[PDB]
Symmetry: D2
Subunit: 268 residues, 4 copies
C-alpha cells in the first residue's frame, strides 16, 4: 500500500502522511520514476498538479489534488477537507477515470525527430522576441489557415481555462472530449479558435524559410522545433488517471476563480 | 419506391427524369410527405433546413445539392447530379444519425411548449429596444446573469451559422458537443462555452421583464413568457443524414471564407 | 431663474426645496421646456438621455445625479446633492460642448429623414429573422459588405453602451472620434473601426431586401427603406454638458465593471 | 538641395538617384545621423519606412515612402509612379504634416532610467518564454486593470494595423489622433483594447516580485525593463514629418492588404 505524496514547497503534509501511516499505508514524499505506488496525492496548485501528474502518467497510477494557495480548476477538493479526502484515500472508494491527454510529435523529413505529450495544452511559440512565426494549420490532412503569428495552442478541454483562455479561447467543460486549437496573435482576418473531435489529427507546419520555434507541454516540458518541420498532435492512447469524488462541479469552480455574477438565478 | 424532391421555388428536371427511368416515385415541394425513403433537395442551407424538417417528421434520411451559393450542409455540388443520382438509385450511401436539440419551455414547472433544432436554438429579446435579462445554467448550476440580445444554443453543425456571427468558435460537424454563445451580452465574461452532449443547458428569463422569442433552425418560432425557463438538451430522435464521398468540412470552410492556404506542404 | 428637474417617475424634494430657498423657479418632468438655464436630472443613463433630449432642444446645459445604479453619464452620486445644488445655485460649474451625431437618411439622393444621437446610432434589421445586407463606407470609400443584425455608430461616450455589448472597445469620454461597430456580422473582418470627427460614415442598405430601423440614443426610432443609405457625421450643434469635480471616467469604469486594481503603486 | 535616399536591400534606385541629379539635387544613399539633407526618400516596405523614419526624426526632416515588395499602409505610392512622385520630390509641392508620435519613459525609484519613442507602437513583453507578466495599467493617474499577460501594446493609430491588430486591437484611421492600448494575452475577464486622448498619459507598472521585461519600439529599438519599474508613455512634443500627396486613402489600403469584400457598394 505505497502512496507517493507530493507537496509544493505546505505544512498539513506531515498530518496526512502520519494519518496514512496509521492505516499501515506506505508513503514517499516529493516537491524521477517514483514507481511501485498505488495513488499520487498532491497538495498545492495547478502548476503543482501538472508536475505530480507528470509522475503518475509514467507509473500508470491515479492522481488526486488538494488545493493550498489560490483556486485551481485541477483540484478535487480544498484543504478544509484533508481528512474527508484522506478518508477516501484509504477507503479506496474514489472513482478513477481516464482523461483525454494529447500526444505531440515533431516530424522532419518525414521522420519523427521528437516526441512529447500534454494533459493540458501544447503551446508552439516563435523563437525570436521579434518578428512573426509563419505557419500552416491543418486538420485531418486538409489545411485551414496560412498565417503569421506568436504561435498556436492545442489544448485539452481541461486546458481551455489556462493559456488557451488567455489566448482568446472559449471555455470547455472538463468532461467533454474534444480538441481546442487557438491561433495565438495571428495576423489574419480569420483567427478564431476551433474545436475538433478526439480523433481528429491536428498538425501545424513551421515555415522553412524562417527561424526555429519552441513547444511547451503543460508549461513544463520543452522542445525546440527546427524550421520547416511539422508538429502533429493527436489523442494519446495512454490517458492520465484521475481520482474523482463528490466535488464542486466545474461550473462552480469557474464562477469562483473568475468571480462571475450569478445573481438572479432561480433553479429547477 | 418514392423520393420527395424539395427545391427553393433547373438541374432538377434532370434529377426527376433520370430518377423516373429507374422507375422511382417522385413528389415535389418547395406537410408530412411520408412513404418515401429518402428526401433529396436542391438549394441552400436554408432550403436544406426546411427539407430536414420533413425528413425529421417522416423518420427518413435527407440529402442535398447546393444550387446557388456554398453551404456547409450540402453533400455535393450541382455538377455531380448523376453521380449522386447514381448513389440515390443505388442506395449505397451511408446513413449516420446527427445530433439534434430538444428545446423545452417550462413555466411554473410545466412544459408550456416544446421544440427541436438541428442547427441552433436562438433565444432573442422581443422589443426592438431594451435588453433581455437572463441567467445561463449548465447542469443545475448557473454561470452568468446578464442583459443581452439573447443567447444562441447551437450544434457543432450550427456553429458556422448565427453562432458564428455572434462571434462563436468554428466547431467540426462530426464533433459531439453543445455550443452556448451569448448574443451581444453586456458583461465582461460573455464568451462561448462548449459542453458534453449529456450537458443540460437551461436559460432562465427575467421575471420582471418582457416576453422573448425562441427561433429554432431559423424557421420554427415560439413565444417565451417572462419568468419562464428555456431547457435545451440532446434530442433522443436524431435527423438522419445521407453521407457520401464529399468535400470534407475543412474544405467547405476554406472554400466558403476564402481562407488562404498558400505554402502548405502535406507531411 | 428657472431649472427644469427631470426624474424617472426622493432626494428630489430636497433639491426642489433647497433650490426654492434660493428663490429658483423649478418645473418637474419624467415637451420643449424652454426658458430655464440648466436641466438637472435624478436617475440613470436612460433617464439622463431623455433629459439631454430636452436640453438639446432648449440649447441649455444638462447635469445629472445617479439615483439607483451606476452610470457613466452622471456627474455626481446621490450623497452630493447639496454639494451639487450648491454649484447649481452658484453657477460656477463648467460648460463644455460634447460631440453629437447627425443621422441623415437619404433615398434616391433625397433626405428622406433626419436625426441626431448623443450616445449611438444603432442601425438594425427589421424582421426577427434573416439578416441585413449592408455596405459600410468611410469618407466615400467602402470597407466591407456583409450581412448582420445591424451596425452601431456611437460616440466615445456611447462606447460603454450597446457598442460595448456588441463587443466594441472602451473609448474615453474626452476623446473626439467616431466608433463604428458591426452588429453580429457574418464576415471574417467585422471588427470596430474608429475615425476622425470629420469622418463621414455612410451605411448603404441592401435594395433587394427588407426595411430597417435606426434607433438614436435608444429612444428616437425611425424607418429605413431598403436601398436607402444612412449618413452619420458630426452634428454642428452639440449638447452642453455641466462639468464639475467628479470621479474621472477611469474610476466609473472600474467601479462599474468591478475591474480589479489590487497592487497598484502610484508612480 | 541634399536628399537622403534609402532602399531596402531595389533596382529602380539608381534611376531615381540619377533623375535627381539631373535637377542638380544632391543625393546620399543607405540601406547614423545623415543630417543636412532636405527630404528622405525611401523605397521598400513598412519595416523599411520605419528605419528611414528613425533617421528623419533625428534630422527633423520629411519622410516619403515608395512600396516595392508587398503592400504597406505606410507607403505613399507604388513603384508604378516613381517618376510622378519624383516629379513632386523636385517640385517640392508635396504637403508636409506632423504625425502623432509617442514618447516612452521607463522610471524606477521615481527616476527616469531610460527613454525612447515610437511612430508606430510600443510593445512591452514578458522576458521568460514561460510564465506570465504581472502588471498594472493606469490611465491619467487612475489605474484600470491589474492582470497577468504576455505584455501590453501602446500604439499610434498608424500602428493599429500592425501588432496591435494581431493582438486584438481595432482599426483606426491614420488621420485620427488618439492612443491605442491593447492588452496582450491577458488572463482577465476584461481585456478589451482602449482608446484615449492624445494628451492622456498611459503608464504601465511592471510587477516587482517578478522577472524583467522588454520594450520594443517600432519593432527595432529595444530596452530592458527592470522588475518593479514603470513604463509611462505620452504624446511626444516632437512629431515625425510626413510627405503627403494625392494617394490612395487609408480605406482602400485596408481593403487591398486584407482583401475585404467591397461588393455591392453603390456610392454617393
Amino acid at each position: 500500500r505505497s502512496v507517493l505524496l507530493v507537496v509544493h514547497t505546505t505544512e498539513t503534509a506531515r498530518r496526512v502522511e502520519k494519518v496514512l501511516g496509521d492505516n499501515k499505508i506506505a508513503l514517499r514524499v516529493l516537491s524521477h520514476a517514483a514507481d511501485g505506488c498505488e495513488l499520487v496525492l498532491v497538495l498545492g496548485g495547478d502548476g503543482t498538479f501538472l508536475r505530480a501528474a507528470e509522475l503518475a502518467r509514467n507509473a500508470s497510477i491515479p492522481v488526486l489534488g488538494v488545493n493550498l494557495g489560490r483556486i485551481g480548476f485541477l483540484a478535487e477538493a480544498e484543504a478544509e477537507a484533508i481528512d474527508a479526502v484522506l478518508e477516501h484515500v484509504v477507503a479506496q472508494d474514489y472513482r478513477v477515470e481516464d482523461r483525454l491527454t494529447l500526444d505531440v510529435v515533431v516530424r522532419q523529413g518525414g521522420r519523427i525527430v521528437n516526441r512529447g505529450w500534454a494533459l493540458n495544452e501544447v503551446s508552439l511559440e516563435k523563437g525570436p522576441r521579434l518578428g512573426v512565426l509563419g505557419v500552416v494549420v491543418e486538420i485531418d490532412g486538409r489545411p485551414v489557415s496560412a498565417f503569421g503569428c506568436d504561435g498556436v495552442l492545442v489544448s485539452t478541454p481541461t486546458g481551455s481555462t489556462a493559456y488557451a483562455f488567455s489566448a482568446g479561447g472559449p471555455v470547455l467543460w472538463p468532461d467533454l472530449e474534444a480538441i481546442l486549437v487557438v491561433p495565438n496573435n495571428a495576423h489574419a482576418l480569420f483567427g478564431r479558435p476551433m474545436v475538433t473531435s478526439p480523433e481528429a489529427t491536428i498538425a501545424i507546419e513551421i515555415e522553412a524559410d524562417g527561424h526555429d520555434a519552441l513547444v511547451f507541454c503543460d508549461g513544463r516540458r520543452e522542445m525546440l522545433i527546427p524550421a520547416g518541420s511539422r508538429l502533429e498532435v493527436t489523442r494519446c492512447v495512454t490517458s492520465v488517471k484521475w481520482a474523482r469524488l463528490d466535488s464542486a462541479p466545474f461550473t462552480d469552480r469557474l464562477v469562483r476563480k473568475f468571480r462571475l455574477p450569478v445573481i438572479g438565478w432561480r433553479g429547477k
